């Protein structure tokens, strides 16, 4: 899960 | 992409 919790950090601003 | 948005925002914890 460590990706998809990357870019959804990344997509959020 | 809102759904994308709110998706992340729950998601992350």
């Given at each position: 899960f460590?990706?998809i919790?990357?870019r ?6």
């Amino acid at each position: 899960f460590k990706r998809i919790v990357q870019r959804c950090k990344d997509f959020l601003r």
